[model samples]
Target chain A: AAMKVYDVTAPIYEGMPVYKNKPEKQPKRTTITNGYVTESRIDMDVHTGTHIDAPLHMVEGGATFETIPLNDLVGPCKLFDLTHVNDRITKDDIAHLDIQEGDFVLFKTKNSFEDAFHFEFIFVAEDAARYLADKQIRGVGIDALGIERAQEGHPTHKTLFSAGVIIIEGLRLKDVPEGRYFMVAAPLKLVGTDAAPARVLLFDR
Target chain B: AAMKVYDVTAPIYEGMPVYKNKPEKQPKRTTITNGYVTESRIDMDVHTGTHIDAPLHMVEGGATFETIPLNDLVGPCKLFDLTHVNDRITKDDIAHLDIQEGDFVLFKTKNSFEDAFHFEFIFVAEDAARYLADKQIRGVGIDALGIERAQEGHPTHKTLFSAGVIIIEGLRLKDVPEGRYFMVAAPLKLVGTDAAPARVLLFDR
Candidate 1:
């Protein structure tokens, strides 16, 4: 392994907290009579772990799993330091970064410190989402599970999704330094689902 | 968008065929009343789609999801055209490829032409698995869902898994040219599963 790879995917477990405190069933293996192969099953809310949200997640008639651009999911991405903010990531928080059109951006915050999911964890505000959407960035990733705090219309998600900006949440960015890196945010190709868990990776630049 | 990327992941759908003709449940979304945000839940067997198998899938007390190295999952990989062989991939079939000790290899077979799963599709023979494991390659990928056919002892899987050769199956390699390319075989971070569905991507080298 010549390249330094950083796995930014949060591990999926039974006890992990998810949106609205939904219960996560423990992963189980369907036992077989044979002694050779083992097959396991997982039944979980897609948003419970590290995942990417398709446009259909927010927009009524919008992109699903297949419509999202493949290039955006794997490419050069810039991680901005937003750890100073205790609450939501607003427009001003990211205004100074080298945000550009077609750029894949990741926000590193204090939420990365949590071993358990925090419902009140830092998230992207509507203004920030709108800013990214307006800038036409390829995607945005945040350390928190939900990109926005329970908003009235889910404006943060809608704004980004409507503008075709991909969103990847629940990133495990605890030890990763904020800088430019290549990312692989690969989500399951579940047809028509709102979201799917992703195994995200980062390569140091 | 500058790089040419080929997504080698099979879409997970309700009607897609699985091992032993196992029934697949149609993906259903638990609708919410509030109408602002949509959350989805998926109940699936880990090995139903494009996936990577851990050692525990075959070898007793072998490595699970967490124990597998991340480097092997995302790295430069070489794809071999084995479409000429209608039967199992034997050691002789791959004997002349520039396979090295730490190389990640992918076999493009005639099975790639299938939109649906074929139980009797091409698979890695025990001799081939033994040869690759013997070569100490980083990993091996096959176009079929199951790496090996239904052998009594499942020797192919056991041999490779026990040897720590990462195995990825169900690759969508149709229309992709055979050559060395960078690959991201990112599987869900499921803790102790024998296998997890992955979103495999290939970039032109």
Candidate 2:
């Protein structure tokens, strides 16, 4: 049996788009002179590219990157098509889907086709966040960089993280069809960090 | 049916041991003073923690991190017990394992139990590398920071990488038993870089 794997992660580069007031400096690659070995140093924000958000990202003194449970990061996940959603993903958008508890839900929005960073990308609504939290989903992933709207207080993130739902952001789901797939969204085990860059993959089992 | 997942990635921190003469500086984390949300800036080497090495790591015009095939990174993998070996893993050590073509092979050496950065860690001998490459293995993983001995003209790495065998290093497999399991070792898509940090996991099917 041949298995199919989907690379749903965006490539990290020097001039990638980042959120405003975020790390403005690009990912620096300083070459080291070794014996034919092309070694380089990397410097960028943990949240710059495709990444995961731990509890510490929104709540003070919450679970950091290392503290996130391993089981929550990899499992069976369903990618729901929300390309019709213009700006926000509301409760009505996901009510038809048979979402269950402990399921990893990924939303494929129109933002997946856009370039690095979009100032006005689609996001999860506050009510939808509360709804998903109530259902006790293991995690929620969006195609955009941030899961919630860019505002003063990130209520969507707070709601999801407080309810122990891991958040996966910056997924490149342009080519991924709507279906159930085995997901592996693993982040760097950076001790005591709020977030870390991740390598997200979807496999047809 | 419930599946158990084993996280086999080493925890990355500021002072974690890296390859000697390669990026001695610790990972820097700068916290941005936002209202209640916590944002951070990260800076480190591409090979800071548990990572994958592309062919470009040693070969001058070899494949970069982005060019590595996705199918080679995740699949059914066999973990061979090599803890009885002291320093070098010769061809005789793995000849009886029945390593098949396009199989993912992970070695459990005595280095898995040692602290980070073992100066005298066990490595694959040059002949063993040639043996595995000749078998056309999809990828090779070890529990140490590097697969080859620290010396000029790294024949082991060259043999493996030159044959398009993906290399996974710095795995934390101390608690994992010697058996076959489904492996997912996804690396950060660092564009044009020689190597990238990866999040490796194993699950019971």
Candidate 3:
């Protein structure tokens, strides 16, 4: 009689905000091949909606979809309410969040409220990326489409990926609470790609 | 160093097989719109690869992506090895499989070895569909792309959908052994569609 699962995956359509440089496809549409009315198809833009990034996104020839394990994609995770943060998620921002080793963290920031394509969306900063990596967390997820603003040398992503931290972007967390929950965010097994589309779910107790 | 997760989602590209009369698209390829090489996009065919089917697949105003709960997509499941069944999965074929009231079931058949996709491909017969529905099974998944061959009035799917049983098609169960495991197959939250693409994973014990 009550809701126990929060579907945190975004409703991907044609006009959803993507990174400025990223091309937006036409609006989502579907039709049948013939009279087979029971079936349908989707032409999905993999990186536009909820998706997961592997080491290959930064380090060429590094771990790609074929190598990343599912354990990093599905497990117990903590959702930190970063809505109070008006700027970048600096080291001091998440310093007292008690992010432990092997923990999976999700940042619920202002981006979840004001959806946009610009890098102005609140993202994890370089110092915070380094802090989480040094803490040996398995993965980090954020509500924004991009995980960082314009930083030289892509330092935020480089540090996190280099430290073997997984990245999940474009999580729809506006309705989720700050607490511990089991996250199921598995990216499709698309061979030969740096990242893949994902569907995210948070189980509530 | 053992493999704990088996990715059962099909690797979709341009030349993969599809249902008979279903149109095929051009080859799968990717490129950068500008200099943003770190992130990529996927234009996925919702029905081609691993995907979930809702009640809307058959009913006029049935449950679509907007309403299917995650519990039906994620939970414990039993992989029934129907490698011996060469034709339609009739009721006699599944009667003794010990299918319980709420058991999520997957049929691993010869189709897993030979992945073609005409209506002639192995599928669930109407009798078996009625049996599973009568037993009140939660869902039924199969390795083949089409869950039913062409029949009068579409009895198989209509029976299952009317009974509120979920359907998952295009699963890559070629390598999975018959056993009980945990299934995590969450489809992306695409608005206004009867079906959605998914990335399926089975956790090994």
Candidate 4:
């Protein structure tokens, strides 16, 4: 039988959580009546929905959205279930799981379902970021608005992104169970941008 | 064996194709030098590079980008090697293929490779479009800037899109051979827009 690819991307709409201290604009479609044809004006933020953060989002001399190597974004992936944890995800939690190299790791927390429509929830602790960096994982995914704590500066963003790991934030994992799946998350090939909204899908045989 | 996904999406740069009449503009990025964050500003037509056209692009009261069903964009796909045909592809040419239902058809024409840089080329004929609509194909992909000829009214766009056949334009099919392949063309879930750029991958097992 052919494998199935389930879409895990959240809808990019207005009121989506953007980085702190940035202008968060809601995208709207306003229709205008013209002489011969109908036209529309779309307004939105680039980082509003399911998005991929390049190293440029944190590191001073890192890959931009357009410059990120295609190899870094495509490969084998693993999904870890951490739904039981109610608080921050720490290094001890990740150490228990056996993670290998070139693995795209996703932490499935309560944040996956709640933060897509709602606001705040759990965040990846600084120690966990350091742990993943040491493991040399290909990338990391989270079901929350931002991978790091939202108190102020995104330290987790710097730790992982600087280590050449692609960060995928704002995913909807309500339908996905705790297991392994082929991950294909591609962002718009916008040149010279720090980040871009992406379309993330998980495929299973 | 795992299926190989060939990424046929073109990069979304500053000066790609918009609707013929609209002016082209480069997507811009904004940064907060003083604040704790840096962000981007993207301003461009919805019908940019490697994008899918919704019914709203042609007819009124049709599905927008947000409303286009997910099944229509992803499924079993068949690639036709029409690169031998130098000009327009008509109904007579495609009728010989004997395509079945729920097929995401991709036309590998010479136009697919030519338009990769910044040149304009010929498009599919309107009769072929109506023929596919008659067959009720799931989606249609092409290598050029549009699926239809650049006529003033765009009859092919109306016929295919009105029949709910998803239109994916601007694919790189130079390396992909002709045969049956699994298609996973997922677009960024940009809400309330006429169209959005997508990363399209085709795999052969």
> Could you tell me which residue pairs clash in candidate 1?
none
Cα lDDT tens digits for candidate 4, B43-86: 55566667787776676665768787776676678999998785
Where is model 2 more than 4 Å wrong at Cα? A21-25, A34-36, A150-152, B21-25, B57-65
Which tens-of-lDDT digit does each residue in A1-205 have in candidate 2? 6877888988877667777534564667677785766566777778867899878878877788888877777779999999999888999888889898999999999999888566789999988999999999999999888888854588898888778889999898999999999888888788898888888989888
Order the candidates by lDDT, highest first. Answer: 2, 1, 3, 4
On residues A4-109, what C-alpha lDDT tens digit does candidate 3 reach at each position? 7888887777677766645554334655533546445555555666878877633246223243456777778999999999878999998988799999999999
Candidate 3's DockQ is 0.52
RMSD of 2: 2.5
Query: Where is the poorest 10-residue window by lDDT in model 1 chain B?
Result: B24-33
List, in order, the clash count of every candidate structure: 0, 0, 3, 1
Minimum summed lDDT over a 10-residue window in model 3 chain B is located at B21-30
What TM-score against the true fold does each predicted structure earn? 0.91, 0.92, 0.86, 0.88
Query: What are the fnat scores of the candidates, in the order listed?
Result: 0.90, 0.86, 0.63, 0.44
Q: What's the ranking of the predictions by DockQ, best on top?
A: 1, 2, 3, 4
DockQ score of the complex predicted as candidate 4: 0.49
Q: What is the interface RMSD of candidate 4, in Å?
A: 2.7
- Among incorrect, acceptable, medium and high, the docking class of model 3 is medium
Task: Give the best candidate by TM-score.
Answer: 2
Quote the positional error of residue B31 for candidate 1 in Å. Answer: 4.7
Best by lDDT: 2
Q: What is the lDDT of residue A59 in candidate 1?
A: 27
